[PDB]
């Protein structure tokens, strides 16, 4: 019987396809002006119309390339692979979807580039001194986490121009520091010193050649340096298959975009590279500082991990900036850079603990949905990101690509990849919403019966003011007949009121501030649900009173966002790991918790109860976390094992519990150990005492 395809998609082949993925068409008058067009597929097939005629195109997602994921990183010969399918061909029909997956891996022994970009303001002279030892010292540590490593060097001290630099009050001051019994080199801006070599020894050599300059103004021009170190990838020499660390070390405030106007530098940062043969940033004195947005898109495009190695006095500052430049890390630097080694090492593990996908060149009318599988086989939906990982781990993501209608006659390609990774899934999209017989269709007057109309795919539409199964009655004065199976049941309604039943069909006379389609004047283009003012909350198109939502919108009203960042907290975890994200808002779970991200829970049990099951987990091989096999992931606090606790006058928290052996375990907890948390356990739990009188 008449179902969806029948009521809507009986106007033509494209209309039939455009209705739904369920629909199919006939060819070459298989049932000559019989009755049923489109309907479904089995039904149409059941009505003889069968052979080279079905016209039922299925959607597809053929994998074109899927090399296996690698085991080693430095082990090449075979090109290193961290994303399991690399290219995948998608064919979608109109208003249709197909799903697929992508396995991302944090590969063991992956090579690493480390470019050291340092402030050389006078304050950094004692820093520079202790850095000479670095390099070979850094090489021996990285030896552990990686095999094939290479490092480089660059330095910055703001634009050499008339506000920041010592203009030239005397000429002698062009070589500054005359003011205070000493000597320092002139202001330079950005100076690339060492291209990324694997000859670690020469790092120590070049750093010893360096010397500091001086700046009148407190803030400095690091962002020129960060930008140029990022985009002059030929000069700096970043490899393709390797992790990129841009260690940015400063002890000062920083100039930002639009500051340059004071200097009379009114030209915006172009994003291009401008470090020539002299290895100096030649745009320095003519181009303005880059904006955070521009810094973000170039760091992302060249897969560079900006590490903020800043001093305590100015750490809050760069933490806030870091937070506006997602993916960036920040650590506390010493007054003399003693602790750089560990900051770099700590930063590396930071940025290889996480894996978030990216999407580039996504066709406008296409929309994607992500589920994340990152712990065991637990699938957390609406998530494209995963954290808490460690080198060797492989996560997985499930993707659903859905098209809305029938886009341009052109095969479009786009890319899904992890942030900072070389590897990527490339998705070739072809929109399959035209029938094979479309082109083989000549209307030109005749051929569609003894008249003048238009012809194609086993049926014909007659020209302006005619229609009819074959070709009859131009404009009423003839209508008086037919009647038509017009309204289902034939209870008298003509064509949903707004329309007149002619020639075995309807003439929807209305054109009421919009479109009006459907063979019984079924569908309104406008009469749709309202959230407040606009149609689909102003986030969707409408057809037969049904909202088709824009990308990143869901629900019947198209008012439910698919964003998760609003559910995120500075914690890192989603909804404070205490709730689920629904339309970019956390619905809090049973702990009696509240707040925008479920961060508040004054009536929650104390940390002790959550740490013990991880002590029992880690140190006793038992508990809930052990049974779910979530020990190794859900807690990377350093559990040490003391023989005694201490009234140390520090952040101590004595937790005691009776274990299943019936012994009283006691452990103190210690956070803010430089932004990280360790956990001490008394190695001698208190137990019952059986007869021990020398026996």
């Amino acid at each position: 019987g008449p179902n969806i395809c029948t009521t809507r998609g009986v106007s033509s082949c494209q209309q039939c396809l455009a209705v739904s993925p369920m629909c199919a068409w006939c060819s070459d008058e298989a049932l000559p002006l019989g009755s049923p067009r489109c309907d479904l597929k089995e039904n149409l097939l059941k009505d003889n119309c069968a052979p080279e005629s079905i016209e039922f195109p299925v959607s597809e997602a053929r994998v074109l390339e899927d090399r296996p994921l690698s085991d080693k990183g430095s082990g090449d010969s075979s090109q290193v692979t961290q994303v399991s399918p690399q290219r995948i061909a998608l064919r979608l029909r109109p208003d249709d979807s197909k799903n697929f997956s992508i396995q991302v891996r944090q590969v063991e022994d992956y090579p690493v580039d480390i470019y050291y970009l340092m402030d050389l303001s006078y304050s950094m002279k004692d820093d520079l001194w202790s850095i000479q030892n670095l390099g070979t010292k850094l090489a021996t540590q990285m030896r552990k986490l990686t095999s094939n490593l290479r490092i480089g060097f660059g330095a910055f001290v703001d634009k050499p121009v008339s506000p920041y630099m010592y203009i030239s009050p005397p000429e002698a001051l062009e070589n500054p520091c005359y003011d205070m019994k000493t000597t320092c080199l002139p202001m330079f801006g950005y100076k690339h010193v060492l291209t990324l070599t694997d000859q670690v020894t020469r790092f120590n050599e070049e750093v010893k050649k360096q010397s500091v300059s001086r700046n009148r103004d407190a803030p400095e021009g690091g962002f020129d340096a960060i930008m140029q170190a990022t985009v002059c990838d030929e000069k700096i020499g970043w490899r393709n298959d390797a992790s990129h660390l841009l260690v940015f070390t400063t002890d000062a405030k920083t100039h930002i975009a639009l500051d340059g106007r004071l200097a009379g530098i009114v030209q915006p940062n172009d994003g291009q590279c401008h470090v020539g043969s002299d290895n100096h940033y030649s745009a320095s004195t003519t181009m303005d500082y880059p904006s955070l947005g521009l810094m973000t898109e170039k760091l992302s495009q060249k897969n560079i991990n900006l590490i903020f190695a800043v001093t305590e006095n100015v750490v809050n500052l760069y933490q806030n900036y870091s937070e506006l430049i997602p993916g960036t890390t920040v650590g506390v630097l010493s007054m003399d850079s003693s602790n750089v080694l560990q900051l770099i090492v700590d930063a590396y593990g930071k940025i290889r603990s996480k894996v978030e996908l990216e999407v580039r060149d996504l066709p406008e009318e296409l929309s994607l949905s992500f589920n994340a599988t990152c712990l065991n086989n637990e699938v957390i939906p609406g998530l494209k990101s995963c954290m808490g990982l460690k080198i060797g781990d492989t996560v997985s993501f499930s993707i659903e690509a859905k098209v809305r209608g029938c886009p341009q006659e052109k095969e479009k390609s786009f890319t899904i990849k992890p942030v900072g990774f070389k590897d990527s899934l490339i998705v070739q999209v072809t929109f399959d919403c035209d029938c094979a017989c479309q082109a083989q269709a000549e209307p030109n007057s005749h051929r569609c019966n003894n008249g003048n109309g238009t012809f194609e795919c086993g049926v014909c539409r007659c020209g302006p003011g005619w229609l009819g199964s074959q070709c009859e009655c131009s404009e009423e004065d003839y209508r008086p007949s037919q009647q038509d199976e017009c309204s289902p049941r034939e209870g008298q309604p003509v064509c949903s009121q707004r329309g007149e039943c002619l020639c075995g069909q309807c003439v929807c006379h209305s054109s009421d501030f919009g479109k009006i389609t459907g063979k019984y004047c079924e569908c309104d283009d406008f009469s749709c649900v309202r959230y407040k003012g606009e149609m689909c909350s102003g986030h969707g198109q409408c057809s037969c009173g049904d909202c088709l939502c824009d990308s990143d919108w869901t629900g019947y009203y198209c008012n439910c966002t698919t964003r998760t960042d609003t559910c995120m907290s500075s914690n890192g975890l989603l909804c404070s790991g205490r709730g689920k994200c629904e339309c970019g808002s956390c619905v809090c779970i049973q702990p009696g918790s509240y707040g925008d991200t479920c961060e508040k829970c004054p009536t929650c049990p104390d940390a002790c109860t959550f740490k013990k099951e991880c002590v029992e987990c880690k140190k006793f091989d038992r508990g809930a976390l052990h049974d779910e096999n979530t020990c190794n992931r859900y807690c990377r606090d350093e559990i040490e094992s003391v023989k005694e606790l201490k009234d140390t006058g520090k952040d101590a928290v004595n937790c005691t519990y009776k274990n299943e052996d019936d012994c009283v375990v006691r452990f103190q907890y210690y956070e803010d150990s430089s932004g990280k948390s360790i956990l001490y356990v008394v190695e001698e739990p208190e137990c019952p005492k059986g007869p021990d009188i020398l026996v």
């Binding site: 407190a218 639009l258 904006s291 947005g293 009423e476 054109s511 990308s551 609003t566």
Partner: protein, 938 residues
């Protein structure tokens, strides 16, 4: 929306001069003519030995787009001594900033450098020059004996400037006092008056200036941007200034008093690095005589649809209120990296609607990043956030971006017509463009068909060609047009009429005009002035019954109209515009006479009725409410019948229900044609006799406030019949209810204490927490989840203080969070134990000595809570039972509450009561193994 973009006036300076970097109008009182002033800060001049001193150009509008430099200073550098310049003019960016008021014009070189008179320096103090006819004075406030970065050495005075009503200059010096920045203001009379060329550091008498501050405030750049306007009630223009690096690059906007340099208000940005303060503007956007503040933060990153940061720029819009509290809203750019908040230029009343307007520039936007200017119209509400026009940059880059919109000036009707015009500067291509506003006109179109219902039998008038008669009717259109400003009196309109609009689409043409015998007809009409509603009539006939078959559909008469463009313009081709919110067509409709009884007049009988699906609407949040409506016609056919459910616009309309075949799915739309508040649903054009309809209309009512006891909907059916054309009006109450799911819950942070208590021993008279026992926290939380709020409540804690005469849990201190006071019936911490640095089994207040804490809770709203943090120490002495060893004790406190008051004092309420108990179990764990008859020892 009325800026002529076809033929704007185009001006250009020499290449590389940054011609257009600063723009303004020159409106001298000595002349009937007006000019425009373009700053060209990199322009070379004839000044001896000075490269790129920059200049300012006076440009003729009176045809001839040629520009002439204003000769401010034709001299090169002065000399401290021989072969030892006192100053450096080359590269001074003179013309980087340009403002004029009447005959006076101020221009500044914010990169002008100055050797000190103490040491050999090169300090960018900045200078300005004030001209008036031939008289020219130099105004260089920052060039004083305060001579380094700690002083005004790097001041760059003239970076931004402004004249006040009255006559007084505001000047921005963003480098003063270690780049804290500075505002300085001076009387124009004073500058000219006290000018002395033999003195480089002139001291003006009534100078107002911001002073140096603490070093945290360094590198803030006060005076980066500047604007003037009255904010401290009445009197004089006060000083507004952007401070872009303020508050850790959050940026700020300071406002100082005009009378003295006293602080009035500050604004602060939400996002660091976004340059909140780059640009500022003051102008009364809502026509209430109160200046309103606009703040550009052009590098702002809003959040995309994906959730990702994206640099689009943002403009803040703060509406001033007679109170003092500004009423602020935000306005985001439309393209990534097109710097939306770069320039905010008040236009005055661009369209003369009665409210001021404003132009906001995204100077690196548009396809081929040529630059865009968005223009936004003001309204009583505030600024209309949907821009009414987009001025597109025209010139492509030579190298540097053209930066069209980087500077702008409006508010000056440079030609005759009573509409302000606009200068846009494009310095990257050394151009400036004047856009001039077009005249706006309001038309009032009339349409009527005198015989509304057409009787096919009534064939009065005869058809011209033939010798027979037809059932004809009269159609009459009419136009009244008028508009403010200079515009012609003779207005030409091309009117077009169409019979049976919703039918010509493929189907038969049921009505035609008498003389043409066509459904379409044109008419070159020529109305004038304003008021004279000029008319023109036409008689249209109806076809013979003998076969247009449709007799139920209405015959919609459609009228549209268009202005003629060039026959309307002035001498230099300034064509007038129609009012953007005025439709250029109107619809009326006739219905063929069908049924209506022997008397030929259709008399309907319309009835409407509803019922309460859900009887309650709980106060304090949004609430879903659907009401079923029964509209029936028991009389004759009602033409254009439609239900008018007037809803209390504390409620919104979602839609008709399509979740039930028992209800009809009507065609509905919400509207408010001044004061009205209604959804209008179609009940059929001819709603035939006896046609009863059933429909569901779902809503959501927000009503959070304590207004009326109920909420009222009025509904009635209405039609276009001459008689009995409406139903009676029918009200429908809905009862507002109170509901406040209030809950109490508690916890004991150490829920247990194992009694092998480490490093403990008895102290005769103890001090410290260590000497008494471990800390036991008991947090108690009362939270109102429920939609409705409560205004008062009582909280009662019962605390197990002592068992027998032994002190169990000893309370050191309790804390409170939220609207709540508390009182303990016993002195807490009697023993003065201070340190902080932050029935055998169950022992409750039944069997134990009770310490009570009463608390008086204030108003808790939906999703809010009061919290009692009770910090106590366990009195170990006791549990070392000197009676004999031990036993497991469960120390239980309990807290109950009672809600006593609600803010909805005129509505059914009810006291809410509940309680919780939190427990701290003290046990040993480590306890004796088997042994027969011995005893214990200490």
């Amino acid at each position: 929306f009325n800026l002529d973009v076809d033929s704007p006036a185009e001006y250009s300076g020499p290449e590389g001069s940054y011609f257009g970097f600063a723009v303004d109008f020159f409106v001298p009182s000595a002349s009937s003519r007006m000019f425009l002033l373009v700053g060209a800060p990199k322009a070379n001049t004839t000044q001896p030995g000075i490269v790129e001193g920059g200049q300012v150009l006076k440009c003729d509008w009176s045809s001839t787009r040629r520009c002439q430099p204003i000769e401010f200073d034709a001299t090169g550098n002065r000399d401290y001594a021989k072969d030892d310049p006192l100053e450096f003019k080359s590269h001074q960016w003179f013309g980087a900033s340009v403002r004029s008021k009447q005959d006076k014009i101020l221009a500044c070189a914010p990169l002008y450098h100055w050797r000190t008179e103490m040491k050999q320096e090169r300090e960018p103090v900045g200078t300005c020059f004030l001209q008036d006819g031939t008289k020219t004075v130099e105004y260089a406030p920052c060039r004083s004996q305060d001579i380094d970065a700690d002083g005004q050495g790097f001041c760059q005075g003239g970076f931004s400037i402004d004249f006040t009503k009255a006559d007084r200059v505001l000047l921005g010096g963003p480098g003063s006092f270690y780049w804290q920045g500075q505002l300085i203001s001076d009387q124009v009379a004073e500058i000219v008056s006290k000018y002395d060329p033999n003195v480089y550091s002139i001291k003006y008498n009534n100078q107002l200036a911001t002073r140096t501050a603490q070093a945290i405030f360094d590198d803030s750049y006060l005076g980066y941007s500047v604007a003037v306007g009255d904010f401290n009630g009445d009197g004089i223009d006060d000083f507004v200034s952007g401070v872009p690096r303020a508050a850790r690059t959050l940026g700020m906007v300071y406002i100082y008093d005009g009378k003295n340099m006293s602080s009035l208000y500050n604004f602060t940005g939400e996002q660091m690095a976004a340059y909140f303060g780059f640009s500022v503007a003051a102008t009364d956007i809502n026509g209430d005589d109160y200046a309103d503040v606009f703040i550009g933060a052009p590098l702002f990153m809003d959040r995309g649809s994906d959730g990702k940061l994206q640099e689009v720029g943002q403009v803040s819009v703060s509406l001033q209120r007679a109170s003092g509290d500004f009423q602020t809203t935000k306005l985001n750019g439309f393209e990534v990296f097109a710097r939306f908040g770069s320039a905010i230029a008040p236009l005055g009343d661009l369209d003369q609607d009665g409210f001021n307007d404003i132009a906001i520039a995204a100077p690196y936007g548009g396809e081929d990043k040529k630059g865009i200017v968005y223009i936004f119209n003001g309204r009583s509400t505030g600024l209309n956030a949907v821009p009414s026009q987009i001025l597109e940059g025209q010139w492509a880059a030579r190298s540097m971006p053209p930066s069209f919109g980087y500077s702008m000036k409006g508010a000056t009707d440079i030609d005759k017509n009573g509409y302000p015009d606009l200068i846009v500067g494009a310095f990257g291509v050394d151009r400036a463009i004047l856009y001039r506003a077009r005249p706006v006109i309001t038309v009032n179109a009339g349409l009527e068909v005198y015989p509304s219902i057409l009787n096919q039998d009534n064939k009065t008038c005869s058809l011209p060609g033939t010798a027979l008669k037809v059932s004809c009717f009269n159609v009459r259109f009419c136009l009244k047009a008028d508009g403010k400003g200079v515009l012609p009196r003779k207005l030409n309109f091309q009117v077009e009429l169409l019979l049976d609009k919703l039918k010509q689409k493929g189907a038969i043409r049921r009505a035609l005009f008498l003389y043409s015998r066509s459904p379409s007809h044109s008419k070159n009409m020529t109305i004038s002035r304003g008021g004279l509603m000029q008319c023109e009539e036409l008689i249209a006939y109806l076809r013979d019954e003998s076969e247009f078959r449709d007799k139920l559909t209405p015959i919609t008469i459609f009228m549209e109209y268009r202005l003629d463009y060039r026959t309307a313009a002035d001498t230099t081709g300034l064509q007038p515009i129609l009012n953007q919110f005025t439709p250029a067509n109107i619809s009326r409709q006739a219905h063929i006479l069908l049924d209506c009884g022997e008397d030929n007049v259709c008399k309907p009988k319309l009835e409407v009725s509803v019922d309460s699906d859900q009887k309650k609407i709980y106060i304090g949040d949004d609430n879903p409410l659907t009401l079923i409506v029964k509209a029936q016609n028991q009389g004759e056919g009602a033409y254009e019948a439609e239900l008018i459910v007037s809803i209390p616009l504390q409620a919104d309309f979602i839609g008709v229900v399509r979740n039930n075949e028992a209800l009809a799915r009507l065609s509905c739309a919400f509207k408010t044609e001044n004061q009205t508040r209604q959804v209008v649903c179609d009940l059929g054009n001819p709603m035939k006799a006896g046609t009863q309809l059933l429909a569901g209309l779902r809503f959501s009512v927000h009503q959070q406030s304590e207004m009326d006891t109920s909420v009222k909907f009025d509904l009635q059916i209405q039609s276009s019949n001459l008689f009995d054309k409406v139903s009676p009006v029918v009200s429908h109450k809905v009862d507002l209810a109170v509901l406040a799911a209030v809950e109490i819950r508690g916890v004991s942070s150490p829920d247990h204490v194992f009694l092998p208590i480490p490093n403990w021993e008895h102290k005769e008279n103890p001090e410290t927490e260590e000497d008494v026992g471990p800390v036991v926290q008991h947090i108690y939380e009362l939270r109102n989840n429920g939609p409705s709020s409560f205004s008062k409540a009582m909280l009662h804690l019962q605390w197990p203080y002592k068992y027998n005469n032994n002190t169990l849990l000893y309370i050191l201190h309790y804390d409170i969070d939220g609207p709540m006071n508390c009182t303990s019936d016993m002195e807490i911490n009697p023993l003065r134990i201070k340190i902080s640095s932050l029935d055998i089994h169950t022992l409750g207040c039944g069997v134990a000595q009770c310490l009570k804490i009463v608390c008086q809770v204030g108003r808790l709203d939906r999703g809010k809570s009061a919290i009692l943090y009770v910090k106590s120490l366990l009195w170990t002495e006791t549990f070392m039972n000197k009676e004999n060893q031990n036993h497991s004790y469960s120390l239980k406190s309990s807290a109950s509450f009672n809600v006593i008051e609600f803010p909805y004092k005129n509505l059914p309420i009810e006291d809410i009561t509940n309680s919780t108990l939190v427990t701290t179990n003290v046990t040993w764990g480590i306890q004796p193994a088997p042994m027969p008859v011995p005893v214990w020892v200490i």
